[PDB]
Protein backbone atom coordinates (compact mmCIF):
# COMPACT_ATOMS: atom_id res chain seq x y z
CA UNK A 1 0.00 0.00 0.00
CA UNK A 2 0.79 3.67 0.57
CA UNK A 3 1.42 6.30 3.22
CA UNK A 4 -0.96 9.25 3.25
CA UNK A 5 -0.24 12.51 5.07
CA UNK A 6 -2.51 14.59 7.28
CA UNK A 7 -2.54 18.34 7.84
CA UNK A 8 -1.66 19.26 11.41
CA UNK A 9 -2.61 22.94 11.03
CA UNK A 10 -4.57 25.17 8.67
CA UNK A 11 -2.59 26.87 5.89
CA UNK A 12 -3.52 29.71 3.55
CA UNK A 13 -1.50 29.60 0.35
CA UNK A 14 0.05 32.77 -1.04
CA UNK A 15 0.46 31.38 -4.58
CA UNK A 16 -1.77 29.02 -6.58
CA UNK A 17 1.25 26.71 -6.88
CA UNK A 18 0.58 25.84 -3.23
CA UNK A 19 -2.50 24.22 -1.73
CA UNK A 20 -4.58 25.89 0.94
CA UNK A 21 -5.84 23.37 3.48
CA UNK A 22 -7.36 22.80 6.88
CA UNK A 23 -6.33 20.67 9.84
CA UNK A 24 -7.25 17.03 9.28
CA UNK A 25 -7.13 17.17 5.46
CA UNK A 26 -5.48 14.12 3.89
CA UNK A 27 -3.04 14.08 1.00
CA UNK A 28 -1.39 11.70 -1.44
CA UNK A 29 2.22 12.55 -2.21
CA UNK A 30 3.15 13.18 -5.84
CA UNK A 31 6.79 14.15 -5.16
CA UNK A 32 8.61 14.46 -1.83
CA UNK A 33 12.21 14.19 -3.00
CA UNK A 34 12.96 17.61 -4.50
CA UNK A 35 12.83 19.69 -1.31
CA UNK A 36 11.05 20.78 1.88
CA UNK A 37 7.82 21.56 -0.02
CA UNK A 38 6.13 18.43 -1.34
CA UNK A 39 3.94 18.19 -4.41
CA UNK A 40 0.69 16.62 -3.17
CA UNK A 41 -2.90 15.86 -4.07
CA UNK A 42 -5.67 16.71 -1.63
CA UNK A 43 -8.28 13.99 -1.17
CA UNK A 44 -10.74 16.76 -0.15
CA UNK A 45 -10.49 19.20 -3.05
CA UNK A 46 -8.93 16.98 -5.73
CA UNK A 47 -6.37 19.75 -6.29
CA UNK A 48 -2.65 19.27 -6.78
CA UNK A 49 -0.01 21.64 -5.51
CA UNK A 50 2.80 22.07 -3.06
CA UNK A 51 2.39 21.65 0.68
CA UNK A 52 4.91 22.60 3.37
CA UNK A 53 6.25 19.39 4.89
CA UNK A 54 6.34 20.83 8.41
CA UNK A 55 2.53 21.19 8.32
CA UNK A 56 1.80 17.48 7.80
CA UNK A 57 2.49 14.12 9.39
CA UNK A 58 2.24 10.58 8.03
CA UNK A 59 -0.75 8.51 8.94
CA UNK A 60 0.25 6.36 11.93
Amino acid sequence: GVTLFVALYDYEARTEDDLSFHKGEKFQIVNNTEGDWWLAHSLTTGETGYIPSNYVAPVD
Binding site: D17, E34, W37, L39, P52, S53, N54
Partner: peptide, 12 residues
Amino acid sequence: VSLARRPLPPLP
Protein backbone atom coordinates in the same frame (compact mmCIF):
# COMPACT_ATOMS: atom_id res chain seq x y z
CA VAL B 1 15.27 28.46 -5.88
CA SER B 2 12.64 26.06 -7.15
CA LEU B 3 9.17 25.72 -5.64
CA ALA B 4 10.17 22.60 -3.75
CA ARG B 5 13.12 24.37 -2.10
CA ARG B 6 11.50 27.60 -0.85
CA PRO B 7 11.73 28.41 2.86
CA LEU B 8 9.07 26.67 4.95
CA PRO B 9 6.43 28.75 6.76
CA PRO B 10 6.94 29.10 10.50
CA LEU B 11 4.91 26.77 12.63
CA PRO B 12 1.68 28.55 13.71
